[PDB]
Ligand binder design. Sequence first.
Ligand SMILES: Cc1nc(CNC(=O)c2[nH]c([C@H]3CCCNC3)nc2C)c[nH]1
Lengths: 155, 39
Amino acid sequence: ETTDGVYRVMTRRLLGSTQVGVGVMQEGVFHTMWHVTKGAALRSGEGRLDPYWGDVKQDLVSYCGPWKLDAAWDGLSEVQLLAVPPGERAKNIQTLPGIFKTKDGDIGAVALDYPAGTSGSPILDKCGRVIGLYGNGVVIKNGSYVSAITQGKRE
Amino acid sequence: DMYIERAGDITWEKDAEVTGNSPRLDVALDESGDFSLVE
Ligand SMILES: Cc1nc(CNC(=O)c2[nH]c([C@H]3CCCNC3)nc2C)c[nH]1
């Protein structure tokens, strides 16, 4: 299955079928977070997806080809997290992102808490363009989780 | 061995649940890809 869209990343290594993450299929390239697959190969029916590019610091990995997603948050408008939770149907959640201020620049951030297995879910702009992936963030003084809007670089 | 399953189309949905705040945080990013708070 190479149809464009959002996918669940599963494993039979543990008890039953366990959802470890989510990813985006676009232009024949599967995009997910590095911590979901650890760079391992993926199955899609009979077919095999082999890793092509990855980086532990960015926490991203692409399969079958280079990173294709290049849209960015405009720093003004609301966005939608298309959350794909384990055992639950895909759901769009609209939020206005916060900001991660770093020594290397500012990054958009979404203050939504979801199970670990939701990592890799796409964040979208009003045109439906993927501006980044959910799942690499931090736990604030509140106890709640805030994820960066993680986007790769398209060469 | 890992495998993928389609979960849907990537579209913006009008009238979706609007929630979540917008906090401005001072963070650091380490060599392992871990975000941490700077205070
Ligand atoms: C509380 C909560 N976390 C999420 C999404 N993130 C994770 O679960 C997570 N992040 C990481 C590291 C590993 C690579 C560097 N980034 C952070 N490991 C895991 C399991 C949703 N809700």
